[PDB]
């Protein structure tokens, strides 16, 4: 949390991944998975994607050092598809930033 | 390559509760889903619930919530469908189905009779 | 609850047809799944995501659709095929079972 911000909440959009097992695996788990990312501040940013890029990496970690308190464990394929839907909710972060 | 067998035939007297097991032998898949599925008198097939076994995750129809109850364990691979409070509706054969990807296999089926 | 709605229900054909079957759904869906069941043995995935054929599947089988409307053909009627075939989907919880096409060959 050294320098970052908190986005509110948002729903958590659903990822394709063209195939079934897949599309039923994360909406199964997705719950599992954030609904708000965290990110560092729009204006040390040159560009969207830049800004994308950490707020999927830092999101991350923030989850999983969060949820292996708990109790949890996460698969090689739940980084995988969390990475998916994290892509998706910092866009809209993004986009929540500049309107 | 990976072999799914369940456990035998139960006979239960109506009102009791069952435990039929299920075991993935040869599994190298990491995860991997379980569906459990009820089919009536040879026809009709019926989804249940699913596990993903390592770990976690369980899901109901919502038709078996206090019906059926699921749960695993990798300390040997199984797992386990609880049936409660057993009515001459709940005979059947209940199937289990590992999913993962491309693969698919089916248990061979146990056979439920609720008898006296 | 999708409800899967399979055609016909019972369906005899002469060897070396091609055999088309149905499933429609009451609501749109993704991908369909196909499973054969002979009497005696547990059903066994014939074709997932559609039209991708299971391991050790034989070629004269295809699936295809979208939405609601999915189908599965045998691209020439054969003895082994003789079977009853399950539609299923995995949209929505619960996933639910087509109520199965009964496939016989004419001899």
């Known amino acids: 949390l050294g320098g970052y911000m908190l986005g509110s909440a948002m729903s958590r959009p659903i990822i394709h991944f063209g195939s079934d097992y897949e599309d039923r695996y994360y909406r199964e788990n997705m719950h599992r998975y954030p609904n708000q990312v965290y990110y560092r501040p729009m204006d040390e940013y040159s560009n969207q994607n830049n800004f994308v890029h950490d707020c999927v990496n830092i999101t991350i970690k923030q989850h999983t050092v969060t949820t292996t308190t708990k109790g949890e464990n996460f698969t090689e394929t739940d980084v995988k598809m969390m990475e998916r839907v994290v892509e998706q909710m910092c866009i809209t972060q993004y986009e929540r930033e500049s309107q | 390559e990976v072999q799914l067998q369940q456990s035998g035939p139960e006979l239960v007297k109506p009102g009791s509760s069952v435990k039929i097991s299920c075991k993935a032998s040869?599994?190298?898949?990491?995860?991997?889903?379980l569906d459990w599925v009820k089919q009536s008198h040879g026809k009709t097939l019926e989804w249940i619930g699913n596990?993903?076994?390592?770990?976690?995750?369980?899901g109901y129809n919502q038709k078996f919530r206090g019906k059926a109850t699921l749960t695993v364990d990798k300390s040997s691979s199984t797992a386990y469908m609880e049936l409660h409070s057993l009515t001459s509706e709940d005979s059947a054969v209940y199937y289990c189905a590992l999913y993962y990807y491309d693969v698919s296999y089916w248990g061979q089926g146990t056979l439920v009779t609720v008898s006296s | 609850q999708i409800v899967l709605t399979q055609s016909p229900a019972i369906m005899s054909a002469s060897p070396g047809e091609k055999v088309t079957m149905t499933c429609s759904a009451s609501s749109s869906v993704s991908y369909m799944h196909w499973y054969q069941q002979k009497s005696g043995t547990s059903p066994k995935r014939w074709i997932y995501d559609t039209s991708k054929l299971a391991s050790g599947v034989p070629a004269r089988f295809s699936g295809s659709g979208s939405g609601t409307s999915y189908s599965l053909t045998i691209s020439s009627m054969e003895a082994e095929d003789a079977a009853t075939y399950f539609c299923?989907?995995?949209?929505?919880?619960?996933?639910?079972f087509g109520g199965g096409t009964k496939l016989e060959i004419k001899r």
């Open positions: 040869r599994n190298t898949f990491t995860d991997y889903n």
């Open positions: 299923h989907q995995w949209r929505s919880n619960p996933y639910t």
């Open positions: 596990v993903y076994p390592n770990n976690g995750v369980t």
